Amino acid sequence: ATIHVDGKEYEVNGADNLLEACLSLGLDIPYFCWHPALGSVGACRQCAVKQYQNAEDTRGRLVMSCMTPASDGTFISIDDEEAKQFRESVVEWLMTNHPHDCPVCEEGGNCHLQDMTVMTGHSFRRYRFTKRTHRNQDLGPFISHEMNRCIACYRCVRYYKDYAGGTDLGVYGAHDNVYFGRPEDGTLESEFSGNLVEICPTGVFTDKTHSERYNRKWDMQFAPSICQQCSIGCNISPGERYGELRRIENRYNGTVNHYFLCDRGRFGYGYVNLKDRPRQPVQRRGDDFITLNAEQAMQGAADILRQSKKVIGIGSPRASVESNFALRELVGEENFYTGIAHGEQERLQLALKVLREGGIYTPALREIESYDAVLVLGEDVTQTGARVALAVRQAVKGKAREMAAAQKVADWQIAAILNIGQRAKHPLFVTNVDDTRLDDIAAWTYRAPVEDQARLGFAIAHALDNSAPAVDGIEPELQSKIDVIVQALAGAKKPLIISGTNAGSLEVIQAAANVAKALKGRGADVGITMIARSVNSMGLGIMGGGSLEEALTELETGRADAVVVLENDLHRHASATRVNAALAKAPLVMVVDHQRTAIMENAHLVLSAASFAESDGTVINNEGRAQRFFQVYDPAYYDSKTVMLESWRWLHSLHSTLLSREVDWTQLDHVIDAVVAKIPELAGIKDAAPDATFRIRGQKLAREPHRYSGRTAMRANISVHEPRQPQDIDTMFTFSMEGNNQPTAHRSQVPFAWAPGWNSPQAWNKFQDEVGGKLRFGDPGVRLFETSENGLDYFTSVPARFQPQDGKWRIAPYYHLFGSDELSQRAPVFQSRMPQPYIKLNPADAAKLGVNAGTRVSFSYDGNTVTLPVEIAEGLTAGQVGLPMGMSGIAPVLAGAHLEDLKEA
Amino acid sequence: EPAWQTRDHLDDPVIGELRNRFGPDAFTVQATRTGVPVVWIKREQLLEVGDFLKKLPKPYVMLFDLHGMDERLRTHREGLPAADFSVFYHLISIDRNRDIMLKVALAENDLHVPTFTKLFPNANWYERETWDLFGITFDGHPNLRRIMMPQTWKGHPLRKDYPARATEFSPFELTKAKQDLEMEALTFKPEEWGMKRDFMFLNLGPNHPSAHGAFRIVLQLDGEEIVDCVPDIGYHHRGAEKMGERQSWHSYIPYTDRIEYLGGCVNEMPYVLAVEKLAGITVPDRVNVIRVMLSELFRINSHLLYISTFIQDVGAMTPVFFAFTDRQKIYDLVEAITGFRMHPAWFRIGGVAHDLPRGWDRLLREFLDWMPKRLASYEKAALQNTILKGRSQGVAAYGAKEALEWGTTGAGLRATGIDFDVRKARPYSGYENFDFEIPVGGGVSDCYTRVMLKVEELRQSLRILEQCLNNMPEGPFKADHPLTTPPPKERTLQHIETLITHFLQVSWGPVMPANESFQMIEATKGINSYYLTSDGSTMSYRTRIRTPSYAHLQQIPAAIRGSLVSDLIVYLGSIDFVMSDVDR
Amino acid sequence: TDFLTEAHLDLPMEFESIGKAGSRLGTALAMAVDHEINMVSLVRNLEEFFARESCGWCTPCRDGLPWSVKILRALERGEGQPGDIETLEQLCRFLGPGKTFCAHAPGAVEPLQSAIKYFREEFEAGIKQPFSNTHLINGIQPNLLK
Ligand code: SF4
Ligand code: SF4
Ligand code: SF4
Ligand code: SF4
Ligand code: FES
Numbered sequence A: 001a002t003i004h005v006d007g008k009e010y011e012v013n014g015a016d017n018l019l020e021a022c023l024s025l026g027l028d029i030p031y032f033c034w035h036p037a038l039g040s041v042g043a044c045r046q047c048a049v050k051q052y053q054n055a056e057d058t059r060g061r062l063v064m065s066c067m068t069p070a071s072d073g074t075f076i077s078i079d080d081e082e083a084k085q086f087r088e089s090v091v092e093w094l095m096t097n098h099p100h101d102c103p104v105c106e107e108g109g110n111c112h113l114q115d116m117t118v119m120t121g122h123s124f125r126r127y128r129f130t131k132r133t134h135r136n137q138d139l140g141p142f143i144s145h146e147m148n149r150c151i152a153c154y155r156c157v158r159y160y161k162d163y164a165g166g167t168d169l170g171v172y173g174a175h176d177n178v179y180f181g182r183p184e185d186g187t188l189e190s191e192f193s194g195n196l197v198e199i200c201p202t203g204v205f206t207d208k209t210h211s212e213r214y215n216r217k218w219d220m221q222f223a224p225s226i227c228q229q230c231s232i233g234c235n236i237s238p239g240e241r242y243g244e245l246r247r248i249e250n251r252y253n254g255t256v257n258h259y260f261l262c263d264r265g266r267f268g269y270g271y272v273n274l275k276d277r278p279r280q281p282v283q284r285r286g287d288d289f290i291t292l293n294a295e296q297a298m299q300g301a302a303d304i305l306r307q308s309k310k311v312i313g314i315g316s317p318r319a320s321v322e323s324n325f326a327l328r329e330l331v332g333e334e335n336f337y338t339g340i341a342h343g344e345q346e347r348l349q350l351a352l353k354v355l356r357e358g359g360i361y362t363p364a365l366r367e368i369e370s371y372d373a374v375l376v377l378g379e380d381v382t383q384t385g386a387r388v389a390l391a392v393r394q395a396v397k398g399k400a401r402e403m404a405a406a407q408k409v410a411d412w413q414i415a416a417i418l419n420i421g422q423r424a425k426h427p428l429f430v431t432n433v434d435d436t437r438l439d440d441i442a443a444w445t446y447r448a449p450v451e452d453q454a455r456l457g458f459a460i461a462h463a464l465d466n467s468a469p470a471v472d473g474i475e476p477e478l479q480s481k482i483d484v485i486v487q488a489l490a491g492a493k494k495p496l497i498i499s500g501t502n503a504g505s506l507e508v509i510q511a512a513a514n515v516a517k518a519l520k521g522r523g524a525d526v527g528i529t530m531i532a533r534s535v536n537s538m539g540l541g542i543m544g545g546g547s548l549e550e551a552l553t554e555l556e557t558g559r560a561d562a563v564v565v566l567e568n569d570l571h572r573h574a575s576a577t578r579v580n581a582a583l584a585k586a587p588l589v590m591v592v593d594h595q596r597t598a599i600m601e602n603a604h605l606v607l608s609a610a611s612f613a614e615s616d617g618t619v620i621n622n623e624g625r626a627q628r629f630f631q632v633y634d635p636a637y638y639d640s641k642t643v644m645l646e647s648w649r650w651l652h653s654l655h656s657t658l659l660s661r662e663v664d665w666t667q668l669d670h671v672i673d674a675v676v677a678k679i680p681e682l683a684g685i686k687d688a689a690p691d692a693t694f695r696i697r698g699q700k701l702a703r704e705p706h707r708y709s710g711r712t713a714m715r716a717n718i719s720v721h722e723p724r725q726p727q728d729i730d731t732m733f734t735f736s737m738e739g740n741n742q743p744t745a746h747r748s749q750v751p752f753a754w755a756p757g758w759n760s761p762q763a764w765n766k767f768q769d770e771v772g773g774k775l776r777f778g779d780p781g782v783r784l785f786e787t788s789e790n791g792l793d794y795f796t797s798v799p800a801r802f803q804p805q806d807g808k809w810r811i812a813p814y815y816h817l818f819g820s821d822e823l824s825q826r827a828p829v830f831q832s833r834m835p836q837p838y839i840k841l842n843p844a845d846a847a848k849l850g851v852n853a854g855t856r857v858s859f860s861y862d863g864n865t866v867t868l869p870v871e872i873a874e875g876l877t878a879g880q881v882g883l884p885m886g887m888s889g890i891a892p893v894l895a896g897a898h899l900e901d902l903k904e905a
Numbered sequence B: 001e002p003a004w005q006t007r008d009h010l011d012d013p014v015i016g017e018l019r020n021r022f023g024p025d026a027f028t029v030q031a032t033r034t035g036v037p038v039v040w041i042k043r044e045q046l047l048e049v050g051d052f053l054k055k056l057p058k059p060y061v062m063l064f065d066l067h068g069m070d071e072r073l074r075t076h077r078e079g080l081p082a083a084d085f086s087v088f089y090h091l092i093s094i095d096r097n098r099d100i101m102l103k104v105a106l107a108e109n110d111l112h113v114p115t116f117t118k119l120f121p122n123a124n125w126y127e128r129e130t131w132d133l134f135g136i137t138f139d140g141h142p143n144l145r146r147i148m149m150p151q152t153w154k155g156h157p158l159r160k161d162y163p164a165r166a167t168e169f170s171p172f173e174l175t176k177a178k179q180d181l182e183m184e185a186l187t188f189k190p191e192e193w194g195m196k197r198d199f200m201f202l203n204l205g206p207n208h209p210s211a212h213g214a215f216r217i218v219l220q221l222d223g224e225e226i227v228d229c230v231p232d233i234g235y236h237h238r239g240a241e242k243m244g245e246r247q248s249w250h251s252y253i254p255y256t257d258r259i260e261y262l263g264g265c266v267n268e269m270p271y272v273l274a275v276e277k278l279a280g281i282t283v284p285d286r287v288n289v290i291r292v293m294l295s296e297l298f299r300i301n302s303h304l305l306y307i308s309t310f311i312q313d314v315g316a317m318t319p320v321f322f323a324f325t326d327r328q329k330i331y332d333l334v335e336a337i338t339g340f341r342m343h344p345a346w347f348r349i350g351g352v353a354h355d356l357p358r359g360w361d362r363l364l365r366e367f368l369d370w371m372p373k374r375l376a377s378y379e380k381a382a383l384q385n386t387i388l389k390g391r392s393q394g395v396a397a398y399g400a401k402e403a404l405e406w407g408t409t410g411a412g413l414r415a416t417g418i419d420f421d422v423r424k425a426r427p428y429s430g431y432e433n434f435d436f437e438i439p440v441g442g443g444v445s446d447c448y449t450r451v452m453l454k455v456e457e458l459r460q461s462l463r464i465l466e467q468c469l470n471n472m473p474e475g476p477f478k479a480d481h482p483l484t485t486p487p488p489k490e491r492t493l494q495h496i497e498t499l500i501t502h503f504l505q506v507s508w509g510p511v512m513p514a515n516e517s518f519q520m521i522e523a524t525k526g527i528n529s530y531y532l533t534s535d536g537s538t539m540s541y542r543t544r545i546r547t548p549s550y551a552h553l554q555q556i557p558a559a560i561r562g563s564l565v566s567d568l569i570v571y572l573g574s575i576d577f578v579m580s581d582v583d584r
Numbered sequence C: 001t002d003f004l005t006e007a008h009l010d011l012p013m014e015f016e017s018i019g020k021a022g023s024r025l026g027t028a029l030a031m032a033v034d035h036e037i038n039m040v041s042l043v044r045n046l047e048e049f050f051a052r053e054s055c056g057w058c059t060p061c062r063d064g065l066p067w068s069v070k071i072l073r074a075l076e077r078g079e080g081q082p083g084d085i086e087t088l089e090q091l092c093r094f095l096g097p098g099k100t101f102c103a104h105a106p107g108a109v110e111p112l113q114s115a116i117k118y119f120r121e122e123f124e125a126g127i128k129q130p131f132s133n134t135h136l137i138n139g140i141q142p143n144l145l146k
């Protein structure tokens, strides 16, 4: 299409509306109610331009550019005097009731309303009357509510309801008393409620966790990092100030997590700021804890390692690729053990084999929203991979999108799309041990044990393709529902099969692979998604090694006298008693970690590693994409006695001191090149980010904004002399403003979005080639593996039905978004949000034991009698007992595990 | 059409002459808010374009400015030739009362331009500074050596990839530079300094017991006569332009104060006028009158300092005490108005920081009654002394040709008989509404002639203050523009729109739309100009400051050659320079 | 619908005839106003209705009808200030068709602009106070704009 803006010709896409087309060209139109992800509704009337019928037209007409299609040969004007005066009048009308709140408002300096008030040039107030006020609600521990600052742009309700699928937020009231919130005080129920702080263009919804230790946006030090709280790998911008992590903002990745995080990623960063973290290396001498510097800790550790006869290394899926590789190099490939259980490692390896050998394309998180039918097998995605659940909701609304497109309704006119697609939606079939949070939009929900879910998947694969193995013992109504699933999936142009390793069953993953193969054989454009557990689970699976049980037997039999545990608490992957016995038997335990774990009581040496905020590295997400996270701040800048290094730096210097009796604090690119040379399956991680020599016209990339303040006074209480600026030899970023963050810079790693006149999160529009699309010059991250030409075979190992045996109790996993991730549990703000641990029981089983709802029962596993109060779960299958995974004492290795001595306390 | 409107200046006769001489495709005309025709010339045609402008019927006789620009990070270069770097040449035709900027584009690898020293002899120091701060080579330059940084300096500080902040201090570098200073006199080679050839060699500096700064002069002597002399400058280099690339538009005003520290608001004036050109701000008349008031008060302060310093350099010691009492009276008024003495930082984008305090007219009337009897006493006690006249008259004289070819402005140029004052030729800040004369010399610029012209300028500034006191407008002290930084304080404190504008203007900075502006003013020591490039951001993309003391110090060897050393001291005392103005 | 005077009483009750007169036929149920009724009070009641019956979806109606309501309340009590009638006219021209989301706000501003057009002396009689948006803050000299 061709448009003429202010007499200048432009070539745009005709399917877009005028506002997004003009913002993609760099033109500045003020706007409030439109969002690139939510569509156009034409409420705020801020985006007004003047449209003319032809070139020889002088009068024109004011139109909303967000609601005007960018048709071919469209003549408009933004800088028309009438349009400018109307946009100024809209800003003024918004400003009549706005509170005098900017100094004491957390959105100041990050406010879209401030930016558009300045952009319209409106700075004189001629309104002399009273301003309306509102009471505020309590929205829980995460979101702070300030209703006075609202401009009634309806972004919150549209996002939270039409996009996120939440139910408890809404718009109440009338003419100019419109209220946006919950009907009563209470916590926002959605797992994606945290994106309201970026969706809201004003200070109504604010980050309460940030509002505790508040600082303005110009005062933050930012870095482009990857969220470490599950395997999705959403791009984040951690921002720090005064040596502590202050905020997690969304970082735009048009291929992964474009505008939206989940609440675990956004608010579960509080473990970084804990005061019990290791900040110096500590050596045990009898009962004494001697604090060492880097050099003497490395010398003593390498000497004791040299006197040892066999050193084993226990990695972790929390650690980066470089740190796991450095441990593998230090202890040797044959002595390296992945720090996960044998069943967990088997499920992880099977998921990786399906992803990179099954011949079926695995979509990115953004690409999930374009699929026509979704089958989720055994994976509670809302609690384990939440952004996948959000993308599944978008893919479900794709049917309403297609129905509206059949009636020649444009894709940005969201109200008409929702009107045409009333309740018609794409087929969604979820299977779990109980009800999921996707049940409100699911076409069918199957509450069954993991064997029965696997048998359902194998039956679906057999009915789609008769070459697949059959299932014997299917009930006729279950067969009818299976047939419903089969005709829904076979009629889909782009079916999607989602599973993962959190189900605790190998057969569920095998059944999902069988369904995907059966759909691939029919010619469908099938995609497969596997949800892992931790941030670098796929990286640890690609690296390979032994299981944690093998390392425990190596420690117990005395074949290994030295163990180096990297970023692993060892209690989430094995029993605590056996781990404690093996670590007490081992004469040398060296724990390289950044969190105070329980295994440092018996550890001979504790190396104060860096977390993601204080380190660089690479992580492989659930779809096999290598992503580089960068260090946010130097921990030794404010506390000069802090020796907190990267884990790969610790292990590489330990290897160098073990070999040549000399420390070597290496560079990140050297470890990256070592990974690429030694492990060819991880050769793609070289291209995740450019090396430390990367420059933009000769200068580095800035971590902090141009107006970063207090540089001669933040450390003046320690010493009036300004310290040396921390040098960054590992990466292309600098710990200063002396760098580049231009939106037109040829790069893909963007620490934060800021353009002049756009201080809000809306500056990501300036950082994209087209708004709502990809990052300009490509999104960061590279897929490690391509789709194989030939797939796997059908898995003939069809499990039997779940048999409830007396005495035994099958543990059904119950994951929680706030409580299943270890570091997220360590965050103090999650302690109020996380629920009290309830053991879930069937009504029939609770009647059999005679226990009611709320009474405490005690059960023993691995000789550990623990007590929990009972919650009645009707959707659970009899013979199963539900356990909340990741919680206090309930390790996630209990999925699929049997249970003994379930008795009332 | 306001004065700040973006003009292309295609109706200038110089554009038609250039088109008729070199053809229509030989150059590109850029539309700016600088007020001058900006013409991008090809590099190979630069010397003939400069010669053609020098041979015009009313020629461009003065090279006003010559400096570089790093355009690698400039995003809004629409209609501009492709350039990793550029070099601009600002030329002034006094007879036409016009000026033209010529810009030469340069690639990143091919950073060399033909030298301009043959057409204009004052291009030498400008090309040395452009090489020093940008790495731009000038082919045919006699001694292309560093002029601000020491010779053992790596990198070019005004480039975009150069880190602006201070490096970590090291005693090793201080000890090495002390050893270099100690062995400098032992291993002095008069070939790297641009000199040639009983010829004594002496160093005047680097420390100097005077009030104009501390700088070093290498003197070649035949007995008492000065055969050759080059100045070693850059000892007072504060990196003010690089700070222009690091501050916001509003928070850079205190840095503009300290360019020449005897001027204050006189130094603030061209910067805020250029920023108001970038912002599209037409300030009201009371703002113009207040800014003229403060500029003339600081002009009287600076001229009293200059006359006292000259008299003390001659040898009389008492008038400096008396004129410092007069400076105390001026400082009392300035302290009452702005709150500070010599770096007020009171001018704002769109106006001034506060209104005039109630009672300022009493202090102005007291100073206006105090000044003239004291000035007459200074004249009759020192300026009419025949010993002072013998020490001053005939010392370092030059005509209009030497003043034009060296870029000499201010009292020296007008002492050569050229009636070129910025306040009359190219009026700014409502200077047309004041009745004042421009004193001129007979055609020869002595030390004594320059000093008496500064005395007459002081009297004319007293006349301006009298007219301003008798006719004071009532109105706003800030413009009503949305880009007036900061907004008026009471509206900020009780209106949310004004609070939002204030919040974003003081924190992130005011957003100047992408343009280029230029303001030239008649400062206390000559012509002071600000050339501002905005890339659409809250910071300046380029802040070029042309100061007159640089040009006067470059004119120093061409006027004192063949004279004595006491004549050199008197000439230094009568130039009206400060080393901060030289190095900035 | 817009107010019409007695000169427009000899007009046929058709859509096109009332359209060229500067009004709408509407529901063709006419309402007559005599000399006893102050037009400022009547238009204030009309605008209070139209501002309380807003749906709150779109900015100009939702935040500009209450401003006109408060201005008309000030004109009713004689507390009007200069710029108020100019504000009403700006509201009338900035709440027309296309500017707002639906047709409630053009129909709201039609009687206001018609009453200003035909009975401006009644609106000008409510302006009795000088314009004052700021109060003096001690220690801060105001910017005395002209
Ligand atoms: S929401 Fe924005 S405009 Fe409103 S008080 Fe906060 S910073 Fe100011
Ligand atoms: S609360 Fe925020 S997002 Fe919701 S309508 Fe108000 S300004 Fe918009
Ligand atoms: S979905 Fe996973 S990776 Fe993304 S923000 Fe949530 S916890 Fe982090
Ligand atoms: S003009 Fe219509 S859509 Fe807009 S707020 Fe008023 S009643 Fe609602
Ligand atoms: S952005 Fe178009 S009316 Fe709100």
Ligand SMILES: [Ca+2]
Pocket: A615, A616, A631, A728, A730, A731
């Ligand atoms: Ca680092």
